[PDB]
Amino acid sequence: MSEKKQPVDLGLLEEDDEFEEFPAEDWAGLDEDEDAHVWEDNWDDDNVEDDFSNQLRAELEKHGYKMETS
Amino acid sequence: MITSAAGIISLLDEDEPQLKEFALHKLNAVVNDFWAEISESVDKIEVLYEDEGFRSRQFAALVASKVFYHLGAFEESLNYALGAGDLFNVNDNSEYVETIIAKCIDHYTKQCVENADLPEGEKKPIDQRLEGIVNKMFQRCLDDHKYKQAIGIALETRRLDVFEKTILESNDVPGMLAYSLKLCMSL
Amino acid sequence: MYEQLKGEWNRKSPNLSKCGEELGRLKLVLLELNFLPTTGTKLTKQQLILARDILEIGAQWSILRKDIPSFERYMAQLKCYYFDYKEQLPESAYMHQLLGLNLLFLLSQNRVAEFHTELERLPAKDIQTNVYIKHPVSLEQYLMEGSYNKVFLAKGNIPAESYTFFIDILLDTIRDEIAGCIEKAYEKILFTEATRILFFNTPKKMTDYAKKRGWVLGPNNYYSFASQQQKPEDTTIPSTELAKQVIEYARQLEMIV
Amino acid sequence: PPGGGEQEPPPPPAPQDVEMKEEAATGGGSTGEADGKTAAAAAEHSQRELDTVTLEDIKEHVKQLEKAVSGKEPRFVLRALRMLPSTSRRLNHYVLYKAVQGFFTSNNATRDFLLPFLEEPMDTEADLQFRPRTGKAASTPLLPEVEAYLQLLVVIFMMNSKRYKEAQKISDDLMQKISTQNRRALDLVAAKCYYYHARVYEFLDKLDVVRSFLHARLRTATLRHDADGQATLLNLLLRNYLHYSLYDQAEKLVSKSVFPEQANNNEWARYLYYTGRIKAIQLEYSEARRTMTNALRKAPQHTAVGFKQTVHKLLIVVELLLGEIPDRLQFRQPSLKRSLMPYFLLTQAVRTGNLAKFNQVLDQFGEKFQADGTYTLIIRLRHNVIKTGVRMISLSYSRISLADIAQKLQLDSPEDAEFIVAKAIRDGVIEASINHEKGYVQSKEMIDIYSTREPQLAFHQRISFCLDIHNMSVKAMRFPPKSYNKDL
Amino acid sequence: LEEGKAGSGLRQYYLSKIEELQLIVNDKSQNLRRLQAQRNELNAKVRLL
Secondary structure, X not given: OOOOHHHHHHHHHHHHHHOOOXXXXXXXXXXXXXXXXXXXXXXXXXXXXXXXXXXOOOOOOOOOOHHHHX | OOOOOOHXXXXXXXXXXXXXXXXXXXXXXXOXXXXXXXXXXXXXXXXXXXXXOOOOHHHHHXXXXXXXXXXXXXXXXXXXXXXXXXXXOOOOOOHHHHHHHHHHHHHHHHHHHHOOOOOOOOOOOOOHHHHHHHHHHHHHHOOOHHHOOHHHHHHHOOOOOOOOOOOOOOOOHHHHHXXXXXXXXXX | OOOOOOOOOOOOOOOOHHHHHHHHHHHHHHOOOOOOOOOXXXXXXXXXXXXXXXXXXHHHHHHHOOOHHHHHHHHHHHHHHXXXXXXXXXXXXXXXXXXXXXXXXXXXXXXXXXXXXXXXXXXXXXXXXXXXXXXXXXXXXXXXXXXXXXXXHOOOOOOOOOOHHHHHHHHHHHHHHHHHHHOOOOOOOOHHHHHHHOOOOOOOHHHHHHHHHOOOEOOOOXXXXXXXOOOOOOOHHHHHHHHHXXXXXXHHHOOOO | OHHHHHOOOOOOOOOHHHHHHHHHHHHHHHHHHHOOOOOOOOOOOHHHHHHXXXXXXXXXXXOOOOOOOHHHOOOOOOOOOOXXXXXXXXXXXXXXXXXXXXXXXXXXXXXXXXXXXXXXXXXXXXXXXXXXXXXXXXXXXXXXXXXXXXXXXXXXXXXXXXXXXXXXXXXXXXXXXXXXXXXXHHHHHHHHHHHHHHHHHHXXXXXXXXXXXXXXXXXXXXXXXXXXXXXXXXXXXXXHOOOOXXXXXXXXXXXXXXXXXXXXXXXXXXXXXXXXXXXXXXXXXXXXXXXXXXXXXXXXXXXXOOOXXXXXXXXXXHHHHHOOOOOOOOOOOXXXXXXXXXXXXXXXXXXXXXXXXXXXXXXXXOOOOOOOOOOHHHHHHHHHHHHHHHHHXXXXXXXXXXXXXXXXOOOOOHHHHHHHHHHHHOOOOOOOOOOEOXXXXXXXXXXXXXXXXXXXXXXXXXXXXXXXXHHHHHHHOXXXXXXXXXXX | OOOOOOXXXXXXXXXXXXXXXXXXXXXXXXXXXXXXXXXXXXHHHHHHO
């Protein structure tokens, strides 16, 4: 039948009616650098990137200061 | 009317059956809509069917038989259907009646075949009401006989005196006997 | 229609002896009144909602006398009036309350799965500003958390409303589950935690559970046995059933051949 | 205006040729096939039919055609009508009636002539012999074209179409049982029609009649059926039970049956999606997970982009409940990405397990998942965060600090720590050894697999099951070659 | 009446479904006997050898 895909597609059209090409470009900012790259490895990459997005993003330079204190 | 209502289950599990009667009567209306709702009440229906406490066995036997072929095998349904005792049902185009009498006839002639090779000894008990409800529709189809299935069912039932009343009123007797023998030689 | 019925309705009678005869009388009257929902003439909504009310308070007396089959009976009968084709029926104020009592029953009978699948209809956004509405779902959420401490600390938060005793009944019927789970003892435990988790000095648990679980008691400590002490098989039987499986493989590979 | 006027005639009758050729090839092919033996051939043209339907679903055909292009609606099949023999004059008439409209112009309309479509079936559909199959192959293909554009007061006309369809066939039937290929097709066709006016049903009013009688219409089908049509009719009922049911005491475990052989390369996927959605409410970690994931890995045929996105959303939603949430990796499409964009931040925030901040964060930008309604799986998730968190603790080390890890989990207290830990132990989803010596609670917490520990009893069921699958796969490489060698 | 054109009808159609099962038996026998004729052809071939 497959005719049940119509209201879903209309729903997608509504989602496109919400904002016009905003998330497309906003996420294209990242995707242009993420283009041509395997999306399998990008899972752990985005995981760690979002995990360290809050605090201790680098922390590699802090180790030297943590040598004498720890 | 009701669909997911569990009230009739509690009413079926309830004593003083006088209020259970019309509840079951209304249950017979929605039983075609949903047969899954009676599934939990099946056991209790069987319980009240076993004992002689309730005055009407056919009321429970009908519900049981109709919910059984909806749930399980046609055999268990046919047991209470033929064990419903005295039952008055007019001819209808509904699926239920034609199917249960279909299985009734099929199992009947099945038992006839099983008892065909055993002329004497270890004879299985046969109820009279079965012969009655079979011969009722049998005669109903034997009115004008429609000049086709009369001798067919007469032969398939494997009964001795059944085809003697079939040849009482008929057209072209030699043709009927020729067709009969032609049907008998091919089986 | 038949009579007032409002006289003994609002009146609270401690004795249910007369309430039983009144109930039977109500059954005799409602007998020919067609309990099942009827859309005929549409003017029957008055006697339908009246019957709904008297069956609601009848369910109140039913849960007052602590009758398990009767409660679910009247709840199943009222569920007919609760779920109907016509939405013209006005929402009662005690509807969500008695439904809450139904949630209490489902929680007490370990039917809480059916409660989880019932969680969809209750947020109808009818009121939502009442704490009593969000009470059962939050209590069951705390049940999913498993913490009995939050419930005990929030036990004093319950208003002057009279179902607090029924909440105590809920705690009473879940206490065997809580204590049963905490006393499982896969290995062993120390009494200092038992003092905190278990109830007060009243020797109900140390008495009942002693004759229930049937375990051994040491020097003020709970000992656990039959834990991972199970001896494995001799490998002979599974080899035989594996041989049977090989036979089945011979069948399935070659049967039709 | 002059340019568009001169260029006006060529575009509209573009599909006409290939459509006429399509209906001629399909109709003439099928009829010309099963004419000799109808009962022999079974569902040979079925896949072709469903393929043509799925192909004609996306049709861009009618756009500017709303004006006087509707002249194709009054005309119809007209193959060998009113008489069985002497079809030569009608073979001439086939060219004639097409030539009539091809002279100068023709009188056309839209909403004028509609209802009297039942004139021919009152006497003879086509040949007075093959009427049911020729009749359905006549009416049913052109009906969705006329019933297209559901909006703009076509609802009443759609109701007329309903009662007409019923009265001519669906009400009960033209005869007791057809017992042929046209019936086997009639199942999925009538089902497709049910899905077609399902939207009209759910649009404004509710169901007091049709699908309730569809049970009696279902059992009217005998139990000797392959239950393909029965299952298709079960799908619409299950979909009608999808939004609001809440009673699991019956149809769950009652609706279970022998489950005969059905593939269709569709119904498996959509029905597994349905029962998966139904079984996702009790949060099944074992069955529902793998079977819905497999269902997601299935149905490559048409579109996994716009269909499987929903079951994927549900998939990851019920996946993050276990504490371990896999993201989108192998499948690359510009749909599921945008669909998961608002949910990505929070589903990534699941593993972190921060109650205080994310409690406000969710409700802050939350739109769609809170538009799912009645805040159910999310009000479960809010306090599921601490359970997945303590599960992450179960995957973490043994020794529990009264300060460090208590601050890390943002919960500091002696009692509730060991209490909630014990509540994680009683679940049976993990392994821990409860011991009290100095007042500290340790654990063995061994996650080690079955390697070199009771190996036989370990992979026994795996070997049996996998060998069963490979063996039915052997059957799958057995029977179809026989289906190849049947005619030769 | 409503039997011979109803009950006997659905009985004959049940017999048609029986004809479908026996059609499965039929073409199974067909492809089995074709494979049989193939193996017999190869056996006759090595017999010629």
